[PDB]
Symmetry: C2
Subunit: 99 residues, 2 copies
C-alpha cells in the first residue's frame, strides 16, 4: 500500500491468534507491543524516548503479520499505550519513506 501521514499510520497486525492495531513507526528502532504473554525466554531491556526509559522484555523470532506480510523478529513487550512496529520489522516487509 501507499500510506499517507494525514493521520497516524495505524495498521492491522497479527501475532499468534491476536489481531491488533499497530503504528508503523520509522522513528523507532524496535517493535514494542502492549503487554501480552508470548512464549519463549525473555531478556529485560531498557528502551527510551521522549520522557525517559521504560523496562521491557525482549522476545526473539516472534512472527507478526503486517497487512498480509509475514515478518519475524525481536519484539519487546511492555507498558506502551500503542503497539509500535519499528524498523527491525519494517525493513522485512519492504517498507520505504518517499517524497
Amino acid at each position: 500500500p501507499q500510506i499517507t501521514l494525514w493521520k497516524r499510520p495505524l495498521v492491522t497486525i497479527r501475532i499468534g491468534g491476536q489481531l491488533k492495531e499497530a503504528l508503523l513507526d520509522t522513528g523507532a528502532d524496535d517493535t514494542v507491543l502492549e503487554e501480552m504473554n508470548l512464549p519463549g525466554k525473555w531478556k529485560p531491556k531498557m528502551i527510551g524516548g521522549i520522557g525517559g526509559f521504560i523496562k521491557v522484555r525482549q522476545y526473539d523470532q516472534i512472527p507478526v503479520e503486517i497487512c498480509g506480510h509475514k515478518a519475524i523478529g525481536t519484539v519487546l513487550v511492555g507498558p506502551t499505550p500503542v503497539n509500535i512496529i519499528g524498523r527491525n520489522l519494517l525493513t522485512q516487509i519492504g517498507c520505504t519513506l518517499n517524497f
Copy 2:
C-alpha cells in the same frame, strides 16, 4: 527520495539559518527539536512519549527545509533524545510510507 530503513532515517534540516540532523519519525505527531533559541513568542506546552510527559516551548509558523523541500509550521523545542520531524511537517513535504 526513497529512504530505506536499514539505517535510522536521519536527514539534514535548515531552521533559523542552522543545519541540523533530524529523524523522520512517522510515529510522532509533532516536530520537537533540541533546546535552541528561535525567534518568536512561544507558549509553554506539555507533550508525552515512551517515557512520558515533558515541558516544551512551542513555536508557530517556523520555516524548515528538509532535504531542500520547505515546510512552514509548528516546532516544539525541549529535551528529546534526537531531533525528530513529525507528521505535521512530513505531510507538508508529501512524505509517504510504501510497501
